[PDB]
């Protein structure tokens, strides 16, 4: 069941004594006219605070259970009134599922209303008053016990009548102390417009007039991002699907620059025999981008494919192609037996078998000098102890899987202190208009309401500005259409009211608003809500603007007429 907590749940936030003062404080209070969950056993959360109340007759209700896990293996606060006193414990007790160990703190101390407030260290406020279904009226809860137990609490339960629970919320209240220091009344600063007016005036009565209380702001709904359409993509079909590949010693190198570096082709293509990345993720390549992309394409045998990697040694890793110890790129190699192997053995691809010194990374040596393996200089004779380093490859279709040719392409990224123009695609959502959006076009970020504009930009212009150097219009990069930008409506809130000595019925005016962003009268001052519009004209009672004056008259309600000049 649910019940309406009229005015209860108000406590003293401090010790200090204030006499005849309307103090305004922000703390966790029970919101006025809230919904108290009526029970009559179950456990409950302890998010930020509780207004546990009760309506006992002969001490039917006994105590409270607190903690996180509500059982052993975790500390749990414990308060029960066993007809003698309240025993407070913080030991990891073994509570049953329905009652009625490493201790760190211990303490042994329907016409009733035992109102209690609990919040965390742990503080308890209590006030017992006779009553006659929460009663209407006001009573403050003086603090009764404070306990320095410091237990993390999230749930609570009850022992054992009327058994209500309220929840505390961080709301600002205006507390009416009396001459003796007793809080005799309070105002919730967010219950309704009249309560806001009382809070902003720091008074429990308000005289006739129009008072500005708060600022109304339209918040954006969705973010929009638009970037120019996909331009010319980087060349990846003339490299990965080229007709003829180069020999490994004379590996074909191509520098990719000034284009969009889409990698999607290397992702959907499932025919790659190897896609391995070093230093960077195989998928996070599009995010970070550099000046140039280098494609090194050549053909080797399957037995030496594993040698295309940093820290590799072999007939290929040091005589035909070497990778640095640290590498910024990825290697891709796929079987090309049907493209590089012919009948009778394909011997059109070569490699280097003899070399004086290991090749420096990213160095190509096409020299075909005669190697001197012994001590007799050759002088280009190709005889005993003199060899031709350019060994051919035995590529035939009848080779095994490992002896078939493999087309290898290596991608290297180099970044220096220079403009970088080679990256992936950017975001580009659908265009929405007539709504306060958080736009971000090709470079500029702002909040506004885009509308189909009327200005005629120049061919090369992408921006719009006013005299105050404020962004006004934008040309959409995808569809070359100019858009007007108007900030989404803002302004102030004013509460038009006759005196509380007369009534508590107020009318709210939103300044400079078209009534579509908040019985509803639209004026030049703004959207007037809660005031009738009369076709008569009387003397001005409460000014509004542009000749509109609202007044409280005949039952009786608040009207909004156009004032008469005598």
């Amino acid at each position, epitope marked *: 069941a649910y019940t309406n907590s009229f005015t209860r749940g108000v406590y003293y936030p401090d010790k200090v004594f204030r006499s005849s003062v309307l103090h305004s404080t922000q703390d966790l209070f029970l919101p006025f006219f809230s919904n108290v969950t009526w029970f009559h056993n179950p456990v409950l959360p302890f998010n930020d605070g509780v207004y546990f109340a009760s309506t006992e007759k002969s001490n039917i209700i006994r105590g409270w259970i607190f903690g996180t896990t509500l059982d052993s293996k975790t500390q749990s606060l414990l308060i029960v009134n066993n007809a003698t006193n309240v025993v407070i414990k913080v030991c990891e007790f073994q509570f049953c599922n329905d009652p009625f160990n490493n201790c760190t703190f211990e303490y042994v101390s329907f016409k009733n209303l035992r109102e209690f407030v609990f919040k965390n260290y742990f503080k308890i406020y209590s006030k017992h008053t006779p009553i006659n279904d929460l009663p209407q009226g006001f009573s403050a809860l003086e603090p009764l016990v404070d306990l320095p137990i410091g237990i993390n609490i999230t749930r609570f339960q009850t022992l054992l009548a009327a058994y209500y629970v309220g929840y505390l919320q961080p709301r600002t209240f205006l507390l009416k102390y009396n001459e003796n220091g007793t809080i005799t009344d309070a105002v919730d600063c967010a219950l309704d417009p009249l309560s806001e007016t009382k809070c902003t005036l720091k008074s429990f009565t308000v005289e006739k007039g129009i008072y500005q209380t708060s600022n109304f702001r339209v918040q954006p709904t969705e973010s929009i991002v638009r970037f120019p359409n996909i331009t010319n993509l980087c060349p990846f079909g003339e490299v990965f699907n080229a007709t003829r590949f180069a020999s490994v010693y004379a590996w074909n190198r191509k520098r990719i620059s000034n284009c969009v570096a889409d990698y999607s082709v*290397l*992702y959907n293509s499932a025919s*790659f025999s*190897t*896609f*391995k*990345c*070093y*230093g960077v*993720s*195989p*998928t*996070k390549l599009n995010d970070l981008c550099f000046f140039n992309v280098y494609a090194d394409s050549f053909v080797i045998r399957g037995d030496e494919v*594993r040698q295309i*990697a*940093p*820290g590799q040694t072999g007939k290929i890793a040091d005589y035909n192609y070497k990778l640095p110890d640290d590498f910024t790129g*990825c290697v891709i190699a796929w079987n090309s037996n049907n493209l590089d192997s012919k009948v009778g053995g394909n011997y059109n691809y070569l490699y280097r078998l003899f070399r004086k010194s290991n090749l420096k990374p990213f160095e190509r040596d096409i020299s075909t000098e005669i190697y001197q393996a012994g001590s007799t200089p050759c002088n280009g004779v190709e005889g005993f102890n003199c060899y031709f380093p350019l060994q051919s490859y035995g590529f035939q279709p009848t080779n095994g899987v490992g002896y078939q040719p493999y087309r290898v392409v290596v991608l290297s990224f180099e970044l220096l202190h220079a403009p970088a123009t080679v990256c992936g695609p950017k975001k580009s959502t659908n265009l929405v208009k007539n709504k306060c959006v958080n736009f971000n076009f090709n470079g500029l970020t702002g909040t506004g309401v885009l509308t189909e504009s009327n200005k005629k930009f120049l061919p090369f212009q992408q921006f719009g500005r006013d005299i105050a150097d404020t962004t006004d219009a934008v040309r959409d990069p995808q569809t070359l259409e100019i858009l007007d930008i108007t900030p989404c409506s803002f302004g102030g809130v004013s509460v038009i009211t006759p005196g509380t000595n007369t009534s508590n019925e107020v009318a709210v005016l939103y300044q400079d608003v078209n009534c579509t962003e908040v019985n509803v009268f639209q004026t030049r001052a703004g959207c007037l809500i809660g005031a009738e519009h009369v076709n008569n004209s009387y003397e001005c009672d409460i000014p509004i603007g542009a000749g509109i004056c609202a007044s409280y008259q005949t039952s009786q309600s608040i009207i909004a007429y156009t004032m008469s000049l005598g």
Partner: nanobody
Amino acid sequence: QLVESGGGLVEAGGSLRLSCVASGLTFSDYTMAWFRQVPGQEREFVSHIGWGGSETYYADSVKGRFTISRDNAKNAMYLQMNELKPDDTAVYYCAADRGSSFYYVRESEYTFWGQGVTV
């Protein structure tokens, strides 16, 4: 090369912790994985961890259950289980490689392989 620890009979619902220690690798510029062996059937992939542990993936039949981690201070990484279904009882193999691959599910893309955990 890759010495691994952990494994044993479980209570069919508890938790277990597996480790794989590299004894001859720098472990700071290498990427590992976890693969599963079942008799009478092919080799299965389960888990994978990148450099440091900021980019990790998991199998579709194991996602959300097991957690992977690595730490360079001891040249080893930790795999912790949380469900241990009576269907995942199999042979555990620790792999490693210099880099990370797009075809990270393929067994051929892990040159280094460790010993086996108890079935």
